[PDB]
Design a protein around this nucleic acid. Sequence first.
RNA 1: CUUUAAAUCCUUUAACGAGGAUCCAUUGGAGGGCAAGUCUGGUGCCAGCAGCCGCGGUAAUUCCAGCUCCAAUAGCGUAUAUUAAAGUUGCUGCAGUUAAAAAGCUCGUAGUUGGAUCU
Lengths: 218, 129, 35, 180, 141, 82, 56
Amino acid sequence: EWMPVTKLGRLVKDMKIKSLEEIYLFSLPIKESEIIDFFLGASLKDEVLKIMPVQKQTRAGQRTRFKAFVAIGDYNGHVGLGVKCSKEVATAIRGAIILAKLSIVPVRRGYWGNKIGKPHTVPCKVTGRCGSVLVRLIPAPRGTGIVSAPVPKKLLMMAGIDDCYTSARGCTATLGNFAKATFDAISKTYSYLTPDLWKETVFTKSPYQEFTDHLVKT
Amino acid sequence: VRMNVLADALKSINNAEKRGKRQVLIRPCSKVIVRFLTVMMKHGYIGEFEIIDDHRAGKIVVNLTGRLNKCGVISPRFDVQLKDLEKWQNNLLPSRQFGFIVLTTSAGIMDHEEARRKHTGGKILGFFF
Amino acid sequence: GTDLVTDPFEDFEFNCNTKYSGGVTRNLMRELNGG
Amino acid sequence: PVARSWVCRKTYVTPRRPFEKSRLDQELKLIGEYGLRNKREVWRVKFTLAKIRKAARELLTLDEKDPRRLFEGNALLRRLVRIGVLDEGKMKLDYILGLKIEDFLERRLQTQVFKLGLAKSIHHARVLIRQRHIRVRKQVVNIPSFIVRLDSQKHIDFSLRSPYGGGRPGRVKRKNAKKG
Amino acid sequence: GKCRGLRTARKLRSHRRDQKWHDKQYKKAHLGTALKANPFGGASHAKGIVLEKVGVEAKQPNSAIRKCVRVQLIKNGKKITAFVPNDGCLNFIEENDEVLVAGFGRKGHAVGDIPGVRFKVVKVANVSLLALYKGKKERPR
Amino acid sequence: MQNDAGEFVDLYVPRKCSASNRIIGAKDHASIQMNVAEVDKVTGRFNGQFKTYAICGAIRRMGESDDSILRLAKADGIVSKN
Amino acid sequence: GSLARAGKVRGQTPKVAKQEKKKKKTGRAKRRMQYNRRFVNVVPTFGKKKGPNANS
RNA sequence: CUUUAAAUCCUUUAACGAGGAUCCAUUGGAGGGCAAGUCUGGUGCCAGCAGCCGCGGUAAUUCCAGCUCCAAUAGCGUAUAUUAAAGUUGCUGCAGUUAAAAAGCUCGUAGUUGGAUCU
């Protein structure tokens, strides 16, 4: 069993947050990885993108730690990427999985041409950046697949993007920056104001206020 | 010096939109500027605007609704044909679901969709999305 | 006599900077996601 | 000056990445499920689908009321329906982009011979087609990559001169009965 | 910045054509000094007469003796140092016999730890080194 | 957000900043949702209903959040004219 | 630079004959063998996610 | 004597034609790039491999081999030219503070580009 240490975690625990989309709606940070577990079940698959050893020079020699880059996400609209450095590889991987869970972001899927069936591609051209690495995602016709490098391909498949064109620029050989720029581009999908989102936002009551009686009662 | 006042107008609108302001002062005003603003307004991107008349060259105060991602000019004004129009909207527009390319044609200034409907190419002025 | 066995994890931690860095990296990657 | 024709054409494309696990596994699964000889058959069907998708995209970029778009889209949709890879109900250029390589591998004479019960396994189907045991309508078809049209699906029989649908025993049965 | 004018096509074309000469590969291919100084004369292979057998010491990080042959090309009479690839393959080659020599794979650049050697031997006395090495063919005598 | 059949395919509809009408991202932890309590006309007491304003993190960072909330309240009849 | 040792190691490697084995199936049969080995057989794995030629 | 101007060639018929169906598939690889053994012998910075990083100095995942795996397959290596990769020639679409780079500065011709405004 898991005992929440946060108000949001406590609300999620006692079955009164219906979906992760509510937390995403009110921009509330996720501080416990158990919330993501509860909401997304075992549909969350994770893949260790990289294990890289980083060495710090010392008087006696070099102190080597290991940084794990782990991508996670159900292939239906949620993706996250975590990076954790530790003394041993197993702890680094476990922490990177935790941080990838804590960073799950909603992915907006759209259409290329005719809006037939489920959305398959990115809604529009979106660009992410990370330290000289620029990654641009472009809508592609149905059945195209992901036209990208292997690392963005993994990140985009985990996000649920069925097909997408991709352009990259910079030192993409730094897998960390490539992955983080792809993650930035993917997370930029729901921040783009398209004409279908011009409808004035009708506010709903926040969880910290919707169940304030529950929060004060226990 | 100052050339292609439409570039200055569109850059001013873009900068004021990025800063989150509600109004932008465009100067000088021009017929092409007013037509471009009308095309942008008919699609809901820009909202109302008023032309201040000074006796030399007017200014425009443009109210800003925060629906505009980017308004830009294409310089030089390449003479685009209808058969070559699609390539242009591949280079400038975010998706095929929204965004417009503004052309000036023998039938007036209008977006790419209206140019295709009227069956007339022209010269590309700019784009907005 | 017998010999002790090595997990891919400790193998990578020991041979991350050696002639066998490529092999231990590949075997660790195969451990972590090899399905 | 010769009266010959030099019009030839390659029917496949090799992948850009020689060795990647995902593609190798996918193509091996396709080979195993459809009993293909090598990866070149997978690449040939992939190339056919790629050309069809390219044509569909080129037509989709045209105006809806374009005579060329209407004519060529109708022709392509009728062709895809004719061989059985596209359902008659969904005859639209957009539904072409939803096709898969499996749909075109399903229409091979090998797959159809296996699916009609004429063979016990897909490899048995290939060997039967090669050994001249199968005919479509009245023509003895030998090529396992033969793509069956929808109107020829019900006319795949066991030939009239083969021991399996004829009645003349083969070389082995004749020799072994000669001992009695 | 670059000139963006409807009547700047001449300036853009001329500037690109002038700036292409600063591309190393383009100038190498088009100037014609490389093709003049190329011993093969633009060919992929060349036949030559083995002048002698030489041993080239490997570059500093690693130590060995690469068995090469100094040959004289039939076409232009130039002198060439061609690596003899496999082991024991210098024993197949003799003095003054004819060898087919190809490039080393780096388009004129020296390959690996052999310094100043950009050619390798493909055939000796009209029988390939591979067949002799694998025992598929004996040296004609 | 709608396909050809008219079904809503978006995972969710994000909030838009009450000032800039710009989408507030799922990870904008500097963004706020102010609730301002409405007040009875004759007694000046809490009615139980409030009006909400969503402000993005960029406007908060720029220091224009105060003027934004004041303008929203003024246009909303909560802060008196002048 | 001494040319005396040319083909030394290949010259003194103890010659070992190739063992006689059954012929390998070719064409569609070899691909079928690969497919059955790699996708129809899943039991023989020992849970270590190793390779097909691991001998440790 | 089906074809063809006269024999071909596969098409057709018939006889003989498979259990190591010996009627025996090869070419390159197995550290990474990059798919696939730090298995076993030999060698001991030698011989050699290695496009690149690198491997060999008496305990070689890399050479010489034996097994075993894997890539394409009646094909597969190698050299060279060239195209994409190269947004490393950049019109789309690069760069110029410190990584290569803005002329010492100004004038000035050709060139390029040129403010509103007329139903």
